[PDB]
Design a protein around this ligand. Structure first.
Ligand SMILES: [Mg+2]
Ligand SMILES: [Mg+2]
Ligand SMILES: [Zn+2]
Length: 462
RNA sequence: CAGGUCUCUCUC
RNA sequence: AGAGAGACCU
């Protein structure tokens, strides 16, 4: 992706979109009980922790575009992947505006406690001033679709979250692009069924992990991915995507049977317009991180990508022996023979992709189930039942979370949730964690899940 | 102060 | 069916 032009909102006739500059995050009662190196992201340019220019850091993920049109390696990949999806028989018919707004069995409803985005966000209109979960009225939507139409600008906001202090130093906070509700709807009307299939079938057929549950899915992955493991993260995946991939996406959608006017919407997220404060900018390429289908389209593009890279990098590759699951830019894959990921990253560079070890190690080492990760979690065979696999969120990640809060009101829920992550690291670590929670007044007040109840409840999922 | 997922908690 | 929250990915 690459920013094409930037114009004053005076010149574009775009309403200013301004967001909060102070974080909700406050140290918690547990801040000094546990060790941690994270602090809230830089939200304002006059942040004293800054060592570089904020806004230039913010937008530096737009590294540019390489390809615009697929090459032969990428065409082949797109058609291999689309053939794989054919067996899912996706309903390419348009989803009803009702089901699009209020969801189905395999698709959540539009998030009503979230901004309606441009222009509503500046017109003081919330999503609930238009949508209503009880009525399931759609008519108020239709009037509004007609009024403002589609292809409405994305509202750029900086993301409130804990980041490493290196990334605070360098001001590399995360950008998200608030989608206008109109676009959200129309995309869900076009692809809601595809969403449904993908959510219902995490695994190696969709090649997506969206809609998986790590407590049960982790035991299937060593079976889903047999052979030699390999894995990736990207630095700045979303913005690094050149339009080629979006073209390649189009081919996939055409092949599985989308109409041409359905497939047309892909250029509307390839080529986007964004308002950040008092300016308007154009982005060519780059996934609007924050549109409908973000995680799915990322995951779909990833599947195209891996294949394209394999067959451009290595002789004798047979993509039928490829197993990969992807969650956005997260990849866990396997092949009958060890894959040299340093060479795939080389090829990645030529497509404008910056690829890294999934651990953000400084080099690519052998990947096996004892060091593999996915969605931050590791893989730990249960000591009693070795065929059942624990998802292991690192204690130091859990430690980072617990040290802050956006609202101490939820301390109970927050701590309980972390506990449900932490017990997979086994009895010893969990009581070490619990003891530490207990060593502060507020911890002794909290309802903390018993280890053996957790384990028994995990066992009975099977 | 976005798009999604999973899970938990509280209700009716 | 409604209200919280935490975590994950962009
Ligand atoms: Mg990344
Ligand atoms: Mg990642
Ligand atoms: Zn443009």
């Amino acid at each position: 992706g690459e920013i094409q032009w930037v114009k004053p909102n005076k010149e574009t006739g775009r309403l200013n979109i301004n967001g909060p500059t102070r974080t909700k995050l406050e140290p918690s009662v547990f801040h000094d009980v546990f060790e941690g190196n994270k602090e809230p992201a830089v939200l304002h340019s006059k942040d004293p922790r800054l060592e570089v220019d904020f806004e230039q850091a913010l937008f530096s993920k737009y590294v540019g575009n390489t390809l615009y049109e697929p090459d032969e390696y990428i065409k082949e990949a797109a058609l291999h992947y689309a053939n794989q999806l054919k067996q899912l028989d996706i309903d390419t018919s348009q989803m009803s505006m009702e089901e699009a707004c209020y969801g189905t069995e395999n698709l959540e409803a539009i998030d009503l406690h979230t901004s309606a985005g441009y222009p509503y966000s500046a017109l003081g209109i919330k999503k609930r001033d238009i949508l209503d979960s009880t009525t399931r009225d759609v008519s108020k939507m239709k009037f509004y679709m007609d009024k403002y139409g589609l292809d409405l600008p994305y509202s750029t906001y900086v993301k409130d979250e804990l980041r490493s202090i290196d990334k605070i130093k360098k001001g590399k906070s995360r950008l998200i692009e608030a989608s206008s509700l109109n676009d959200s709807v129309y995309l869900r009307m076009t692809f809601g069924h595809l969403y449904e299939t993908f959510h219902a079938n995490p695994g190696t057929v969709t090649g997506s992990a969206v809609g998986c549950n790590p407590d049960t899915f982790w035991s299937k992955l060593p079976i889903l991915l047999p052979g030699s493991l390999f894995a990736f993260d990207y630095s700045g995946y979303d913005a690094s995507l050149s339009p080629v991939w979006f073209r390649a996406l189009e081919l996939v959608l055409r092949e599985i049977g989308y109409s041409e006017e359905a497939v047309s919407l892909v250029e509307g997220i390839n080529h986007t317009h964004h308002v950040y404060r008092n300016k308007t900018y154009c982005v060519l390429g780059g996934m609007p991180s924050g549109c409908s289908g973000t995680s799915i389209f990322n995951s779909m593009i990833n599947n195209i990508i891996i294949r394209a890279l394999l067959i451009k990098t290595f002789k004798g590759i047979d993509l039928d022996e490829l197993n990969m699951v992807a969650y956005g830019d997260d990849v866990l894959a396997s092949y009958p023979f060890p894959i040299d990921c340093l060479e795939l990253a080389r090829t990645g560079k030529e497509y404008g992709l910056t690829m890294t070890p999934a651990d953000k190690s400084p080099c690519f080492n052998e990947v096996n189930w004892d060091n593999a990760t996915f969605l931050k979690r590791g893989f730990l065979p249960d000591e009693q039942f070795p065929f059942l696999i624990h998802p292991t969120m690192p204690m130091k990640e859990i430690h980072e979370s617990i040290r802050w809060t956006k609202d101490a009101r939820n301390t109970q829920d927050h701590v309980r949730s972390l506990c449900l992550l932490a017990w997979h690291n086994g009895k010893q670590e969990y009581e070490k964690f619990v003891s530490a929670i207990r060593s502060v007044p507020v911890g002794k007040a909290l309802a903390i899940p018993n280890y053996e109840n957790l384990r028994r409840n995990w066992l009975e999922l099977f």
